[PDB]
C-alpha cells in the first residue's frame, strides 16, 4: 500500500534479520505474487500481505515474465521496481 | 551521432579553455559520483542524451530502451556505444546533473520529459540550470539536474 | 608460458591471463591428439 | 603475484578441474584457429568472376567483344565481450565456516572462492557451447527472452543461406518421411571441389532412437542409421561420417562438412572464462568476483549446411 | 540503398561453384559487349545517376557544368559507371551506341524504349530496344538489357 518502505531480498533465520533494499534503490529480481493472473508488461501493486498483484499504484513495478508456480501457493515472478509514480 | 562522422578540414586550436564543453560529443555528466548506478540496455533508435523507456517485444527477444517520457519514463541515456548498440542508462531513481536535449527556457524553470525524450517547460522531473544552447538548426541542449519524479 | 609449467611465475595479472589462454589452447591440442573418433 | 593475490593462486590451482567443452567434438583440429581480440570485428575479402554474355565468334573483322566481370564481397565477423558476477566467501572468513565435511554456509548458499569459481566456469562453458550450436543466448527452456546480439554472429543452426528442410507435423513419427527430407536436402548440398572430406551429423536423442529401427516389410541387418551413413557417403566421396547426439538439440538434424575451406571457427583466444582482477570487498564476510568470456567467430560458406526441423506442433 | 556497391557487409562467403546467372547484379559496371574504339567521358555527378540516362546541367557560372539523371529532348548520354570518391560519372555520348543493363521504370525483347524525365527506360522518339525482360533486384529497382542507337523518330 502507501506504507511501503522497501523489499526484503534475504533473511538470516538464526539471527532473525532481514536484508532490505530501500524503495529509493531500483531492483530487478523474483518476488512473490498473489496469484498466476500476471502477464508480461503488466502494472503490479504490492498488497497488504506484501505480494505483487495485477492492477492507484504509488510505485512503478512492471513484470518481466509470467507467474511461475513452485508450491501450492508459491508464485514467483520476475519484476523490476524503479521508484515511485506521481 | 554523438561523434561527428564527417572529418574536420582543419586542426583545432587548443589555446582557449573557455566554452569548450558545449558540444554534442560530451558524454556523461558535469558532476559524477563514483556511487552512481549505471546500466546498459539494447538501443532502439538513437536515444542519446534523451529520456528512455522500457519496451517489451513479443517475448522472443529481451527488453530494450527507446527514447520517450511521460508516465513511461525509466531513465536517462548519458552514453551510447555504436559498435554494440548499447545505451548507457541512469535509472530515474538515481539523480543526474548534465546536458540533455531540449525541445526547440531559462534557469529556474521546471522541465518534464515529452513523448520523444526531449525536455520541455511544464509532475516535474528536472530543473533547468542554464538557457537553451543551439548546436544545429533543430538541436538544442540545456544543463539540467534530474531529481526523480514529484508532482 | 602455461599454467601446466610449474616453473611459471606470473609477474602480474596480465601475464596470468596470457598463461590461462595458453593453458586452454594446449588443453585443446591435447584433447584432439587423444581423440580417436 | 601469487604471494600477494590469493585469488590468482586459487584459480591457477583449480583451473585443471574444469572440463573441456563438448563443442570441440563438432569440429576438426584444423577447423579452429584462435584470434587475438576481445570486442571488435575481423573482415575478409573474396573475389569472384562472372560471364556477362555469350562468347564472341572471331570471324573476319570485329571490335565489340563480350566481357567478363568481377565482383568483391567483404565478410565481417563480430566479437562480443560479456561478463558474469558471483558471490563467495572471503579468504579470511573461510576458517569460521570450515565444517568437518563441507566448507561454506549451507543455509546462506555461500561457497569458498575456489569452488564457486569452478561451478561458475562450468555453467558459462555450457552457455558458450549452446551458443556455438544454436546461435542464440537464452536461459529459458522455452527459449524466449533471448539476448539481442550483434549481426554477423551466427551459430551452426541459425546460419543463414543454408539448406533448410521442414518435416510436417503429421509425419513426425514416420522415419521414412524424415529420411525423405534428408535426401532432398542432401541433394541440394553444393560441396563443389571440396566433396572429398569427412562429414558430421548431430541429432537429438529422440532422433537417435528412431535411427536404430530396422529399415523399411522390415529389413534384415539394415537400419535407418546404416542407410543414412551410405547416403552421406555417396556425396562425400565415401569419406568418414561421424554421428553425435546432443541434448541441447531438440527435433533437429544438422549435417555439415568437416573441411576448413568451407566452414571455419575463429574464436577469440579469450573466449573461454577468465577471472577479473576487480574483487568487491566489504566489512562483512561476503565478496564478489567477475568472470569474462568472448562470443563469436563462426564462419561458413553458403549452402554447405543442412538444417532439418521436425515440426512437433 | 541505391549505390553500386552495397554498404552493408555480407555475413557469409559466397559459393563460387555455379557459373550461370551470376551477372545480373547492380554492381555490374560497364557494358556486356565493349569495343576498344568507344568514346567515354567523365563528368561531375549531380545526385546519383548511375545506370541512368543523363543530361547536361548548368549552374550559375562559378562552377563548371555537371550531369544529372534525365531524358527526353535533353538527353546527352548514358552513365555506365561512377566513382564515389571523386564523384565522377563516366558517360558514353548518345552519338556512341551502348549495350548493357540499364534502369527500367517500374516488357519483352523487341520492345521500343525511350528515356523518361528521371533517366529511366520506359515503353514507347525511340532510343533503344529491349534485349530481355525486366529483372527485379529490389522492390523498385528493375534492370533491363538494352542497346542504344541514338535518336530516331
Decide: residue A3, CB within 10 A, 0-12 exposed, 13-18 middle, 19+ buried: exposed
Nearest 5°: the CA angle C1, C6, C7 is 65
For CA atoms D35, D36, D40, D44, the dihedral sign is negative
Determine the distance in angstroms separating the CA of A2 from the nearest CA of chain D, rounded to an integer: 32
D–E interface: beta-carbon pairs under 8 A: 87
| Relative orientation angle of helices D113-134 and D6-14, to the nearest 10 degrees | 60
- The DSSP annotation for D173-232 comes to S-HHHHHHHHHHHHHH---GGGGSS-EEEEE-HHHHHHHTSBP----SS-BHHHHHHHHH
Interface contact B83-D80, CB threshold 8 A? no
Interface test with B, best of D77, D141, D148 (most B CBs within 10 A): D148
Q: Which of B30, B28, B36 is nearest to B93 (CA)?
A: B36
CB of E122 within 8 A of CB of E113? yes
DSSP state of C22: H
Q: Does D312 touch chain E if contact means CB atoms closer than 8 Å? A: no
Which among D40, D147, D150 has CB closest to B62?
D147
Cα gap B150→B148, rounded to integer Å: 7
- Contacts for B16 with CB less than 8 Å, ≥ 6 apart: none
Q: Which of A55, A46, A54, A48 is nearest to A27 (CA)?
A: A46
* D108 contact residues in A (CB cutoff 8 A): 12
DSSP state of D35: B
First to last CA, chain C: 30
Asked whether at least 3 C-beta pairs link D and A within 8 Å, the reply is yes
Q: How far is CA C28 from CA A45, D28, D75, D272, E6, in A?
A: 52, 11, 27, 12, 39
Interface contact D148-B85, CB threshold 8 A? yes
Q: Does D109 touch chain A if contact means CB atoms closer than 8 Å? A: no
Q: Which of D280, D228, D297, D310 is nearest to D76 (CA)?
A: D297
Decide: residue D11, CB within 10 A, 0-12 exposed, 13-18 middle, 19+ buried: buried
Amino acid at each position: 500500500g502507501e506504507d511501503l518502505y522497501g523489499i526484503c531480498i534475504d533473511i538470516d533465520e538464526f539471527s532473525k534479520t532481514a536484508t532490505i533494499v530501500p524503495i529509493t534503490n531500483n531492483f530487478e529480481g523474483y518476488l512473490v505474487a498473489k496469484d498466476s493472473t500476471v502477464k508480461v508488461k503488466d502494472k503490479l501493486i504490492f498488497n497488504k500481505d506484501g505480494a505483487l498483484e495485477k492492477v492507484k499504484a504509488t510505485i512503478n513495478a512492471t513484470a518481466l515474465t509470467d507467474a511461475k508456480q513452485i508450491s501450492n501457493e508459491v508464485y514467483l515472478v520476475k519484476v523490476a521496481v524503479f521508484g515511485n509514480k506521481a | 551521432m554523438k561523434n561527428p562522422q564527417q572529418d574536420s578540414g582543419l586542426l583545432s586550436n587548443s589555446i582557449d579553455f573557455r566554452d569548450q564543453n558545449l558540444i554534442f560529443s560530451n558524454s556523461g555528466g558535469v558532476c559524477t559520483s563514483s556511487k552512481d548506478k549505471i546500466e546498459n540496455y539494447p538501443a532502439k533508435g538513437y536515444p542519446y542524451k534523451r529520456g528512455v523507456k522500457l519496451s517489451f517485444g513479443d517475448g522472443t527477444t529481451e527488453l530494450e530502451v527507446e527514447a520517450g517520457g511521460g508516465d513511461d519514463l525509466y531513465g536517462v541515456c548519458s552514453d551510447i556505444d555504436e559498435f554494440s548498440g548499447m545505451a548507457t542508462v541512469i535509472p530515474i531513481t538515481n539523480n543526474f546533473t548534465g546536458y540533455l536535449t531540449l525541445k526547440k527556457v531559462n534557469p529556474g524553470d521546471k522541465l518534464n520529459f515529452n513523448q520523444h525524450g526531449e525536455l520541455e517547460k511544464v509532475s516535474v522531473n528536472a530543473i533547468a540550470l542554464s538557457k537553451a544552447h543551439k548546436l544545429t538548426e533543430d538541436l538544442f541542449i540545456v544543463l539540467a539536474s534530474v531529481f526523480g519524479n514529484r508532482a | 608460458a602455461s599454467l601446466l609449467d610449474s616453473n611459471f611465475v606470473p609477474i602480474n595479472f596480465t601475464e596470468f591471463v596470457q598463461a590461462i589462454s595458453n593453458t586452454y589452447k594446449q588443453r585443446r591440442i591435447q584433447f584432439y591428439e587423444n581423440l580417436k573418433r | 603475484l601469487f604471494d600477494e593475490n590469493y585469488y590468482a593462486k586459487a584459480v591457477a590451482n583449480i583451473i585443471g578441474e574444469v572440463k573441456d567443452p563438448i563443442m570441440y567434438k563438432w569440429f576438426s583440429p584444423d577447423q579452429i584457429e584462435d584470434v587475438d581480440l576481445q570486442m571488435g570485428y575481423q573482415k575478409t575479402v573474396k573475389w569472384d568472376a562472372f560471364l556477362n554474355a555469350n562468347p564472341t565468334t572471331i570471324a573476319n573483322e570485329v571490335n565489340t567483344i563480350s566481357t567478363i566481370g568481377f565482383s568483391s564481397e567483404v565478410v565481417r565477423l563480430n566479437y562480443l565481450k560479456l561478463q558474469y558476477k558471483f558471490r563467495h566467501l572471503k579468504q579470511t572468513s573461510e576458517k569460521f565456516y570450515t565444517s568437518d565435511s563441507y566448507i561454506g554456509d549451507i543455509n546462506n548458499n555461500l561457497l569458498p572462492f575456489a569452488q564457486a569459481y569452478k561451478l561458475a566456469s562450468s555453467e558459462i562453458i555450457k552457455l558458450i557451447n549452446h551458443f556455438v550450436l544454436t546461435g542464440t543466448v537464452s536461459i529459458q527452456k522455452d527459449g524466449k527472452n533471448q539476448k539481442r546480439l550483434l549481426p554477423n554472429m551466427y551459430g551452426l543452426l541459425n546460419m543463414p543461406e543454408q539448406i533448410k528442410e521442414e518435416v510436417a507435423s503429421g509425419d513426425k513419427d514416420k522415419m521414412d518421411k524424415i529420411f525423405e527430407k534428408i535426401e532432398a536436402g542432401l541433394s541440394k548440398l553444393e560441396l563443389g571441389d571440396e566433396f572429398s572430406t569427412p562429414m558430421m551429423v548431430i541429432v537429438d536423442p529422440a532422433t537417435s532412437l528412431k535411427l536404430v529401427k530396422p529399415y523399411a516389410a522390415a529389413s534384415s541387418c539394415e537400419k535407418w542409421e546404416d542407410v543414412l551413413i551410405q547416403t552421406i557417403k555417396a556425396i562425400n566421396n565415401r569419406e568418414d561420417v561421424y554421428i553425435e547426439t546432443s541434448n541441447l538439440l531438440k527435433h533437429k538434424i544438422l549435417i555439415y562438412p568437416l573441411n576448413s575451406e568451407l566452414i571455419k571457427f575463429k574464436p577469440s583466444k579469450y573466449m573461454l572464462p577468465t577471472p577479473n582482477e576487480q574483487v568487491d570487498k566489504d566489512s562483512t564476510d561476503v565478496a564478489h568476483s567477475y568472470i569474462d568470456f568472448v562470443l563469436g567467430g563462426l564462419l561458413a560458406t553458403r549452402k554447405t549446411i543442412l538444417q532439418v526441423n521436425i515440426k512437433q506442433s
